[PDB]
Design an enzyme around this catalytic site. Structure first.
Site, PDB file in Angstrom:
ATOM      1  N   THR A   1      -4.248   5.717  -2.823  1.00  0.00           N
ATOM      2  CA  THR A   1      -4.580   5.633  -4.244  1.00  0.00           C
ATOM      3  C   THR A   1      -5.131   4.270  -4.639  1.00  0.00           C
ATOM      4  O   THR A   1      -4.861   3.261  -3.973  1.00  0.00           O
ATOM      5  CB  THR A   1      -3.353   5.911  -5.135  1.00  0.00           C
ATOM      6  OG1 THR A   1      -2.370   4.894  -4.914  1.00  0.00           O
ATOM      7  CG2 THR A   1      -2.747   7.261  -4.818  1.00  0.00           C
ATOM      8  N   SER A   2      -5.882   4.252  -5.740  1.00  0.00           N
ATOM      9  CA  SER A   2      -6.348   3.011  -6.331  1.00  0.00           C
ATOM     10  C   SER A   2      -5.175   2.246  -6.918  1.00  0.00           C
ATOM     11  O   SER A   2      -4.303   2.832  -7.556  1.00  0.00           O
ATOM     12  CB  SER A   2      -7.396   3.292  -7.414  1.00  0.00           C
ATOM     13  OG  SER A   2      -8.597   3.737  -6.812  1.00  0.00           O
TER      14      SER A   2
ATOM     15  N   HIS B   1      -1.720  -1.709  -0.360  1.00  0.00           N
ATOM     16  CA  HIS B   1      -0.745  -0.776   0.177  1.00  0.00           C
ATOM     17  C   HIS B   1      -0.149  -1.373   1.458  1.00  0.00           C
ATOM     18  O   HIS B   1      -0.769  -2.202   2.123  1.00  0.00           O
ATOM     19  CB  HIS B   1      -1.381   0.581   0.467  1.00  0.00           C
ATOM     20  CG  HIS B   1      -1.755   1.352  -0.765  1.00  0.00           C
ATOM     21  ND1 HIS B   1      -0.823   2.006  -1.540  1.00  0.00           N
ATOM     22  CD2 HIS B   1      -2.960   1.601  -1.333  1.00  0.00           C
ATOM     23  CE1 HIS B   1      -1.436   2.612  -2.545  1.00  0.00           C
ATOM     24  NE2 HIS B   1      -2.732   2.381  -2.442  1.00  0.00           N
ATOM     25  N   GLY B   2       1.054  -0.946   1.815  1.00  0.00           N
ATOM     26  CA  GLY B   2       1.639  -1.412   3.055  1.00  0.00           C
ATOM     27  C   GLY B   2       2.749  -0.523   3.560  1.00  0.00           C
ATOM     28  O   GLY B   2       3.178   0.408   2.867  1.00  0.00           O
TER      29      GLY B   2
ATOM     30  N   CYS C   1       4.143  -2.293  -0.132  1.00  0.00           N
ATOM     31  CA  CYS C   1       5.366  -1.597   0.258  1.00  0.00           C
ATOM     32  C   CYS C   1       5.779  -1.979   1.672  1.00  0.00           C
ATOM     33  O   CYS C   1       4.960  -2.434   2.465  1.00  0.00           O
ATOM     34  CB  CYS C   1       5.199  -0.083   0.148  1.00  0.00           C
ATOM     35  SG  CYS C   1       5.147   0.492  -1.595  1.00  0.00           S
TER      36      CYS C   1
END
Lengths: 141, 93, 4
Positions: free
Chosen positions: A29-30, A88-89, A130
């Site tokens: 997601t953005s 993100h992660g 994350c």
């Protein structure tokens, strides 16, 4: 001598990697709101006299190339190094726009034996991402 | 004298190992929000670990998620300071 | 609020 020498001619670089939009095929997601983060960081580290460089929406290849190139600069006149990752992660991983990068791969460029002009100098990695999928339910006090 | 090749790194993680990290679409992430605020207020005053401890407290105390999805509602976050530093770090000389 |  219990404190790092921070009066070199320059405080050092602050590299901000701001990944907001991801390749459709990744299914990620953005990251709405991340530009607010990137702007806040830019101003904050500007006021600490860091040479800030903002980079937006980098692929995994571009992230590794940027980190490699930055680690091969001459940091002799710089007190420190800062890198901020916004993406993100998962545990141990940060996402480029087209797939993941091992955090170890990124930080290894700056090892005391691999970046000699930063040996003995503080190398700060600030990571908004994350680290898994657990949720903290908290406890009332 | 050699030093370890892993010495003098600091990893300021937004969240604990294994956990999600929260970002507000209007205000920015809880962690970065808090980090900038504490750096602005204390960079001329506190050592960096003590600044990051204030960030830990701010995120832990002042933020809680709001979601229409019960799975994701009313959740909390603690950042995670990982220090392999060998000296105190002050942004002022 | 979203997660990363």
């Amino acid at each position: 001598d219990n404190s790092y020498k921070m009066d070199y001619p320059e405080m050092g670089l602050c590299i901000i990697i701001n990944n907001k939009n991801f390749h459709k095929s990744t299914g990620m997601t953005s990251r709405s709101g991340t530009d607010v983060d990137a702007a806040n960081l830019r101003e904050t580290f500007r006021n600490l006299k860091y040479e800030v460089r903002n980079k937006n929406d980098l692929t995994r290849e571009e992230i590794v190339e940027l980190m490699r190139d930055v680690s091969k600069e001459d940091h002799s006149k710089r007190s420190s190094f800062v890198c901020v990752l916004l993406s993100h992660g998962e545990e141990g991983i940060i996402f480029g726009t087209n797939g993941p990068v091992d955090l170890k791969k990124i930080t290894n460029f700056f090892r005391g034996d691999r970046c000699r002009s930063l040996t003995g100098k503080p190398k700060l990695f600030i990571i908004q991402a994350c680290r898994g999928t657990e949720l903290d339910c908290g406890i009332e006090t | 004298h050699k030093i370890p090749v892993e010495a003098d790194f600091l990893y300021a993680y937004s969240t604990a190992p294994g956990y999600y990290s929260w970002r507000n679409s209007k205000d920015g992430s809880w962690f970065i929000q808090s980090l900038c605020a504490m750096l602005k207020q204390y960079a001329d005053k506190l050592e960096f670990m003590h600044i990051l401890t204030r960030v830990n407290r701010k995120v832990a105390d002042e933020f809680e998620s709001f979601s229409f999805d019960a799975t994701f509602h009313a959740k909390k976050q603690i950042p995670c300071i990982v220090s392999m530093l060998t000296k105190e770090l002050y942004f002022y000389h | 609020d979203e997660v990363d």
